[PDB]
Amino acid sequence: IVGGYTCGANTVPYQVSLNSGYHFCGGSLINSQWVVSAAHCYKSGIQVRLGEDNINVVEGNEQFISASKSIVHPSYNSNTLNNDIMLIKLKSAASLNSRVASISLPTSCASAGTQCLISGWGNTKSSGTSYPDVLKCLKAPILSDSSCKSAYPGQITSNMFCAGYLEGGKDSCQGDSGGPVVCSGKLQGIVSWGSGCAQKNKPGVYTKVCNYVSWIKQTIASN
Ligand SMILES: N=C(N)c1ccc(Br)cc1
Ligand SMILES: [Ca+2]
Numbered sequence: 732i733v734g735g736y737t738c739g740a741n742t743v744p745y746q747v748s749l750n751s752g753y754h755f756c757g758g759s760l761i762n763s764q765w766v767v768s769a770a771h772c773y774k775s776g777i778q779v780r781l782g783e784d785n786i787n788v789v790e791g792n793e794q795f796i797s798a799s800k801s802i803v804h805p806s807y808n809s810n811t812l813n814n815d816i817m818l819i820k821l822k823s824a825a826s827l828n829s830r831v832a833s834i835s836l837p838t839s840c841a842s843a844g845t846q847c848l849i850s851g852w853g854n855t856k857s858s859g860t861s862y863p864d865v866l867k868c869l870k871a872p873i874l875s876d877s878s879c880k881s882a883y884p885g886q887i888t889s890n891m892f893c894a895g896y897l898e899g900g901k902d903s904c905q906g907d908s909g910g911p912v913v914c915s916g917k918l919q920g921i922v923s924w925g926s927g928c929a930q931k932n933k934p935g936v937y938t939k940v941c942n943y944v945s946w947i948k949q950t951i952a953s954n
Pocket of ligand 2: 783784785786787788789790793
């Protein structure tokens with residue numbers, strides 16, 4: 732997160748860190764057994780880390796649970812990033828509490844102009860790299876479809892939306908991949924892509940979760 736703020740420990744209790752020896756992506760806990768992340772975060776050997784604030788220190792509220800299965804969306808296209816969503820099943824159910832809590836899926840698609848909360852442990856610099864160890868947060872509005880397509884002509888599908896600031900300076904970034912965009916208390920987006928981070932006229936692009944609720948619900952019901 733570039734240009735954001737330190738959230739405060741466990742104030743984003745649905746935020747997870749995906750660890751394969753190191754933190755490599757975020758995700759969102761949607762019930763005690765399932766995490767939503769980006770398809771571009773797929774790899775083997777995933778451990779889901781819940782209740783995290785500082786990802787380099789065991790502070791006492793964490794739960795570390797190996798993934799038993801990952802399910803990348805059948806239509807994910809890694810060239811265009813269309814359908815950039817994946818489900819991760821936990822080997823055992825998380826113990827839900829005030830610091831580890833699920834986030835609801837949307838029932839409708841959020842509107843342009845809605846202020847959302849984006850969070851993660853990604854790079855905090857728009858040039859160079861610095862990785863924070865505590866969770867960072869960013870308030871960002873959903874941008875109009877017209878502005879999004881003007882920023883990325885020929886690249887925005889109906890399964891994507893832009894959020895952030897066209898003037899730059901505030902954005903998600905590498906390492907935030909797969910983490911939540913929460914609007915009106917529900918999971919509306921997944922950190923997906925963007926040209927650089929926090930660059931002028933290059934806002935963040937996010938998977939449009941409201942288009943995947945049927946697939947999520949049916950997949951969870953059978954796995
Ligand atoms: N929002 C962005 N600018 C962005 C986020 C994650 C990755 Br990976 C690349 C770009
Ligand atoms: Ca920790």
